Design an enzyme around this catalytic site. Structure first.
Site, PDB file in Angstrom:
ATOM      1  N   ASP A   2      -5.160  -5.921   4.710  1.00 56.26           N
ATOM      2  CA  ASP A   2      -5.625  -4.568   4.426  1.00 56.26           C
ATOM      3  C   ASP A   2      -6.081  -3.885   5.704  1.00 56.26           C
ATOM      4  OD1 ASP A   2      -5.129  -5.043   1.748  1.00 56.26           O
ATOM      5  OD2 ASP A   2      -7.175  -5.735   1.346  1.00 56.26           O
ATOM      6  N   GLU A   5       5.478  -9.829  -0.319  1.00 57.72           N
ATOM      7  CA  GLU A   5       5.530  -8.573  -1.052  1.00 57.72           C
ATOM      8  C   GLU A   5       6.828  -7.818  -0.798  1.00 57.72           C
ATOM      9  OE1 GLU A   5       1.883  -7.075   0.425  1.00 57.72           O
ATOM     10  OE2 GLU A   5       0.678  -8.374  -0.870  1.00 57.72           O
ATOM     11  N   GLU A  38      -1.108   0.739   0.244  1.00 57.80           N
ATOM     12  CA  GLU A  38      -1.077  -0.693   0.513  1.00 57.80           C
ATOM     13  C   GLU A  38      -0.572  -1.413  -0.729  1.00 57.80           C
ATOM     14  OE1 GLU A  38      -1.868  -2.143   3.466  1.00 57.80           O
ATOM     15  OE2 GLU A  38      -1.060  -4.045   2.698  1.00 57.80           O
TER      16      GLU A  38
END
Ligand SMILES: Nc1ncnc2c1ncn2[C@@H]1O[C@H](COP(=O)(O)OP(=O)(O)O)[C@@H](O)[C@H]1O
Ligand SMILES: Nc1ncnc2c1ncn2[C@@H]1O[C@H](COP(=O)(O)OP(=O)(O)O)[C@@H](O)[C@H]1O
Ligand SMILES: [Mg+2]
Ligand SMILES: [Mg+2]
Ligand code: NI
Ligand code: NI
Ligand code: NI
Ligand code: NI
Ligand code: NI
Ligand code: NI
Lengths: 488, 488
Positions: A471, A313, A282
């Site tokens: 997550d 990201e 992750e």
């Protein structure tokens, strides 16, 4: 127009994965766990802090603005600054002593497990997964409080001569303290008399003290290291995270290079015990771009099979990977943004040689998968739908306590914002010849170089807690993919 | 003249070591274990064998003398040969099938644990040593029968996902059969009618079938290999033996070189888990001198701290180490023999860089020790006296069943043959200036390069069983030395 078809698929996905998870024999979740603590401070509280510190020192500390909390005076000085100046701020502390002082002198209103690993650990625990092996470097007694008592959840501990797996509560080292983040919140009208000056707070605001202790690193004990093959033998995959706390320089002669080399060995050792194991990483925001590049290129690229990240990201990764323009296009929020998200995702898959790149955005998910993947596009679609459902439930309810809670997320509507965003991508990919209108509305898109699966997601409008959803999304999908594949 | 002084020392040695053995936390004993079976065959027995085989085939097999046993006809053919020709013989078999045929069709009168490791394993078990970890490659159910039920004695076994230590009886693999040696004995007057010819045996004689199966090697499972550090962490020393069954050539592409490289890694891994560990190797006759040289030079020399061998074996080692004359002098049995034994022992210590070389002969022991040894010459002397006592008891009683049995050996007299043999060495070493009459009659001799400890031993004149005494001697001394040293 018709989410009714998507809705049926969601139901099929839930039933199939619910049953299939029985097949996952174990999963190793490691590295970043911590305690997030929240405290709303009133006037009586501030008064006790001032009763514990010297004003002359705090005023002197306040004159020279401090960029870190080492002493309780540093805390009060920063706290007062952020109290009078309206702006919010995050300040790091490099010791566990600060937490202890706060616990003994302030208190907190709520606390919760934090960090990517710790959250995924508890998630998969309550989800009924067998053999959830968590690993937290220098686990403490307080930290273990925030793990859940599940027989399937374990942690490694050394019992005077042998390395064994016990529950987190029974596996801590009394000699360590925990990484805890303190979020301090104050509100309009707070009055404080300091150094004869009277301060009243203009607007609501929070202060965050983020513990970043230099001794907690991406490393493990020799005992654990030599037991990697035996762990790997007994799990089907591993979820690895926390690489963002690697620093360029460590005072004891170590550098980022050494912990990259360690990270990769950990992965290789695991593969020594099980050659068929699948490793997920992750990803998250990493301020320092030298480190981000090493994590992606030096560590993640050929040794990892699966990566999970949010929209922003993807841009961070593209940026240090040589695609500044494409990173700029995803960050812009306009119609093209999702076209750049797609192509960027495709970049990451090839440039980093992975089996799958899972990008979770606000109204949709996009997963690009290599052609030599061990599971089918249809199965992958089942996995994103399941992960989308798990995220709906967790947003609804604040947290997953059982495999049955997940079914409440099936009753959250497919987001229209997300569905219409795909419409833009649909036109682009059709005009590109990559895609046919039927194949996209199916959500499965096949291409010589890679397959790519896109779904619209179930989005909650008045959610209880938005902490750890991303997550959760990546974890739920990865295990769903692990359930689908087969072994003898 | 005065063994009375030696006698007091023996008593002091026994009491001190008896108490001290409490301190040894574990010891890993590995490699060569096997079953020695003895059968005295009468006429009714031979008749059943012939009832199971074809005479025409056996006669044809007998015409061409067979140098190995692969078929039950091969056995009968060799058996008949050694029956008519007076001479004794040893013949190898390369399969476990031969043992099984013999068990199903012949039977045995007695059987006993065999091999250097298996004997030492049971010895230290009955001796009360904690954590005796035995390791036998491809341990079988029959083999485990011959280990003793002691809680302190364990063996590694893999339980579907984890490597664990259980008792030998509960740690076997049902899929293997055991290495067993069959000794067949016949006596004067045995009559057998074969192929119309009548054979009567002239004198008593024995036939030995020695199982040397090519798949049993000096190797271990990956699971065990990765657990070496955890084992080493939990033991104080290791006793390693069986290196004589390494062949030049293995049909699957392996050669002696590969198993030397493996042997040394096993030692290094153990040292990774415990840097203070002390490794002993028991040496034995090794017919092939290329292999003997590799074992000594390539494996034993810098990685091992302690070596144990008999008089003849010292000559074998010297011979392949470049000292043919000195090996010739020890083999001669005359007065000089013990002078050459001494100097040879001194050679082996330096040429092979060891902490101690223990040579056990018939009436005396000779141990040369390096100056950087962790234990004192006085302690070493205590260890040889203890080992000498353990050997007396085992010769008396056939076997050690408890730590108390050892006390019976204190009542076996110091051998006069052995004492007078030292007298020759005493004169030599005094005249050499190495030694003073007082220091030798003390049994402790110190020299710039090394210390050397010599004792006279307790020798039994009508002993019950002489099998494994030498192995016993070296083991008892090494653990006694392990008890003496200290750690925190
Ligand atoms: N109200 C909501 N309902 C469903 N999913 C949500 C909601 N809010 C956020 N999410 C999902 O959670 C993700 C946020 O995760 P991320 O930005 O990676 O931070 P973190 O990993 O710390 O949660 C988004 O990608 C989004 O898809
Ligand atoms: N009757 C006995 N009493 C005491 N010790 C004996 C007796 N017979 C033999 N020994 C000892 O046992 C040793 C024999 O061991 P060795 O020749 O190495 O064969 P193994 O190791 O197979 O026993 C000799 O060195 C000797 O000191
Ligand atoms: Mg995230
Ligand atoms: Mg011997
Ligand atoms: Ni208060
Ligand atoms: Ni273990
Ligand atoms: Ni690099
Ligand atoms: Ni009989
Ligand atoms: Ni283990
Ligand atoms: Ni060599």
């Amino acid at each position: 127009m018709d989410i009714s078809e998507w809705e049926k698929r969601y139901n099929e996905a839930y039933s199939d994965i619910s049953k299939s998870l029985k097949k996952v024999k174990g999963i190793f979740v490691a590295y970043n766990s911590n305690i997030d603590a929240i405290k709303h401070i009133d006037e009586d509280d501030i008064e006790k802090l001032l009763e514990q510190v010297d004003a002359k020192e705090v005023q002197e500390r306040i004159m020279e603005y401090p960029r870190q909390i080492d002493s309780p005076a540093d805390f009060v000085a920063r706290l007062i600054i952020s109290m009078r100046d309206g702006k919010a701020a995050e300040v790091p502390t490099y010791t566990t002593d600060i937490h202890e002082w706060l616990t003994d002198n302030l208190g907190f209103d709520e606390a919760r497990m934090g960090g990517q690993a710790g959250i995924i650990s508890n998630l998969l625990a309550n989800m009924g997964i067998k053999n959830v092996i968590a690993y937290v470097p220098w686990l403490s007694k307080e930290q273990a409080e925030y793990f859940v008592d599940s027989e399937n959840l374990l942690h490694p501990v050394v019992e005077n001569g042998k390395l064994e797996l016990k529950h987190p509560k029974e596996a801590y080292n009394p000699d360590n303290k925990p990484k805890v983040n303190w979020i301090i919140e104050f509100s309009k009208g707070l009055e404080v008399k300091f150094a004869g000056e009277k301060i009243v707070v203009p607007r609501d605001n929070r202060l965050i003290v983020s513990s970043r202790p230099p001794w907690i690193r991406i490393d493990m004990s020799e005992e654990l290291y030599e037991h990697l093959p035996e762990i790997g033998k007994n799990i089907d995959g591993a979820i690895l995270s926390g690489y963002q706390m690697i620093k360029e320089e460590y005072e004891d002669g170590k550098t980022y290079k050494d912990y990259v080399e360690k990270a990769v060995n950990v992965i290789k050792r695991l593969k020594e015990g099980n050659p068929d194991i699948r490793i997920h990483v992750e990803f998250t925001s990493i301020q320092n771009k030298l480190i981000r590049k090493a994590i992606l290129k030096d560590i993640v690229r050929k040794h990892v099979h699966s990566l999970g990240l949010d929209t922003v990201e993807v841009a961070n990764a593209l940026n240090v990977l040589g695609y500044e323009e494409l990173a700029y296009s995803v960050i812009k929020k306009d119609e093209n943004a999702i076209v750049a998200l797609y192509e960027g995702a495709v970049i990451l898959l090839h440039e980093l040689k992975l089996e799958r790149v899972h990008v979770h955005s606000l109204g949709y998910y996009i997963c690009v998968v290599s052609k030599d993947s061990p599971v089918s596009p249809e199965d992958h679609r089942k996995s994103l739908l399941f992960a989308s459902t798990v995220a709906a439930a967790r947003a609804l309810l604040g947290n997953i306590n059982s495999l049955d809670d997940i079914e409440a997320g099936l009753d959250v509507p497919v987001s229209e914002q997300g569905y219409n965003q795909l419409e833009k991508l649909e036109k682009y990919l059709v005009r590109r010849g990559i895609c046919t209108l039927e194949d996209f509305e199916n959500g499965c898109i096949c291409t010589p170089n890679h397959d790519v699966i896109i779904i619209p997601t179930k989005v909650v409008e008045k959610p209880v807690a938005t902490v750890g959803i991303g997550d959760t999304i990546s974890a739920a999908a990865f295990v769903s993919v692990l359930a689908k594949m087969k072994k003898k």
